[PDB]
């Protein structure tokens, strides 16, 4: 663009904005997304506004850049401009969220966190349920989605550990053991204040599992008396290490 200042956006993206406005006070915008040129005009001078383009197969594409530049939304529609096919919304430290939708129902949603970890929701039905995978540093957790919550499950012996993630993204964790023996049965107390699950066996505390803000799990053992934590917390790097903690 004759004019053009290049403006960096969330998502490696860039937009060219005219240096000056036209007679009507508007600014010209152009962007190449993938290999598709999008153009638009805006009453702001910073790169924000709406850009539009059309695929070779008639699909309608729409890039919306928020007024403060902290968020882009990229949508691809059917040729009608109204039936939404896919939508990717990128914001700060750079989460992405991508969705795919037929027929007006959201059938798939992927969320990439700023640390690279992912929640992947597949097979999503109109009642809001589907399959859930959480892609973490070293391993993957699997479970299910409902309208109320995501539940990721790990089983070891007679123990089931459930990591629940609310709509707000708040994590809570449950453990149940169908063991019939007071000698070996695991029980656990969740402290939402510390994001920590304390496992007890036969009235003694045995381990703390901390579910961190970095989307990791650490494990730390209590002394043989159940009195105090010893050593240092150790980051869990594989699913088998979670299972070891549930033995």
């Amino acid at each position: 663009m004759k004019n053009s200042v290049s403006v960096d956006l969330p998502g490696s993206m860039k937009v060219l904005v005219s240096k000056s406005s036209n007679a009507d006070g508007k600014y010209d915008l152009i962007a190449t997304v993938d290999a598709l040129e999008l153009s638009g005009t805006s009453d702001k001078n910073n790169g924000s506004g709406v850009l539009e383009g059309v695929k070779a197969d008639a699909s309608k594409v729409k890039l919306t850049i928020s007024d403060d530049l902290g968020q882009t939304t990229l949508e691809v529609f059917k040729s009608d401009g109204s039936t939404l096919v896919s939508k990717k919304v990128t914001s700060n430290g750079s989460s992405t969220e991508e969705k795919i939708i037929i027929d007006g129902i959201i059938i798939e949603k992927i969320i990439t966190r700023a640390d690279g970890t992912r929640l992947e929701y597949t097979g999503i039905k109109s009642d809001g349920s589907g399959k859930a995978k959480e892609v973490l540093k070293g391993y993957v957790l699997e479970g299910t989605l409902t309208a109320e919550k995501t539940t990721l499950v790990v089983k070891e012996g007679t123990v089931t550990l459930s990591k629940n993630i609310s709509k707000s993204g708040e994590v809570s964790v449950e453990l149940n053991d169908t063991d019939s023996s007071a000698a070996t049965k695991k029980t656990a107390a969740w402290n939402s204040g510390t994001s920590t699950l304390t496992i007890t066996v036969n009235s003694k505390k045995t381990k703390d599992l901390v579910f961190t803000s970095s989307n990791t799990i650490t494990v730390q053992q209590y002394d043989s008396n159940g009195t105090s934590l010893e050593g240092s917390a150790v980051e869990i790097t594989k699913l088998d290490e979670i299972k070891n903690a549930l033995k």
Side-chain angles (χ1 to χ4, degrees):
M1 181 195 289
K2 182 174 205 188
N3 280 106
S4 196
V5 174
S6 190
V7 173
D8 308 292
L9 296 160
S12 67
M13 275 179 300
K14 289 185 209 194
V15 65
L16 297 188
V17 56
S18 58
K19 277 184 184 199
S20 55
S21 64
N22 65 17
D24 279 346
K26 302 216 183 180
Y27 285 84
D28 284 340
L29 302 169
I30 311 283
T32 300
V33 186
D34 311 304
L36 189 63
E37 190 114 277
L38 310 176
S39 58
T41 66
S42 179
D43 59 8
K44 284 174 145 35
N45 82 337
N46 70 337
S48 64
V50 173
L51 302 82
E52 291 173 321
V54 293
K55 291 211 225 159
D57 59 42
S59 301
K60 295 256 199 143
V61 175
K62 187 169 162 186
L63 170 66
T64 307
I65 310 153
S66 70
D67 296 350
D68 70 359
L69 308 174
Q71 179 175 77
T72 69
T73 302
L74 184 74
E75 291 165 311
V76 187
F77 297 87
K78 317 245 261 221
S79 60
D80 54 14
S82 75
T83 307
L84 225 190
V85 164
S86 69
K87 166 146 156 199
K88 181 162 134 195
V89 185
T90 301
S91 0
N92 72 269
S94 211
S95 20
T96 324
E97 170 196 291
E98 280 205 19
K99 312 191 286 190
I100 315 194
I101 146 166
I102 15 140
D103 182 59
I105 321 173
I106 294 159
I107 67 165
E108 183 178 311
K109 194 211 316 162
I110 308 306
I111 291 165
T112 305
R113 307 201 186 96
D115 68 2
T117 64
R118 289 186 269 150
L119 287 173
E120 301 188 352
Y121 296 116
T122 52
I124 302 179
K125 320 307 180 185
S126 38
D127 76 340
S129 69
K131 286 260 171 61
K133 170 174 290 205
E134 196 175 20
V135 183
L136 300 168
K137 182 178 179 94
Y139 57 101
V140 174
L141 302 174
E142 307 179 11
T144 60
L145 176 77
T146 78
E148 300 167 351
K149 61 171 170 49
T150 298
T151 297
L152 301 161
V153 176
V154 173
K155 290 178 164 171
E156 168 64 32
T158 55
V159 183
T160 302
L161 180 73
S162 300
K163 170 187 170 184
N164 295 306
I165 297 170
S166 68
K167 294 148 56 196
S168 338
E170 298 175 25
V171 172
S172 59
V173 177
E174 294 169 306
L175 180 154
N176 191 54
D177 189 355
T178 58
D179 197 333
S180 65
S181 169
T184 49
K185 177 195 181 59
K186 284 63 139 181
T187 56
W190 177 251
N191 184 358
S192 37
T194 56
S195 307
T196 305
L197 192 74
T198 305
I199 305 174
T200 292
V201 186
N202 188 24
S203 285
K204 288 170 168 131
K205 296 184 286 196
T206 53
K207 329 184 160 73
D208 275 9
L209 285 184
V210 186
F211 294 72
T212 80
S213 62
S214 308
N215 305 118
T216 62
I217 303 178
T218 67
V219 56
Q220 204 178 357
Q221 323 291 324
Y222 282 84
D223 65 53
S224 55
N225 287 326
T227 307
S228 172
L229 289 174
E230 56 180 33
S232 290
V234 173
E235 186 180 293
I236 296 281
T237 71
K238 52 189 202 181
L239 178 65
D240 278 356
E241 288 172 347
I242 303 180
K243 290 180 169 242
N244 294 173
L246 297 181
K247 279 178 202 179

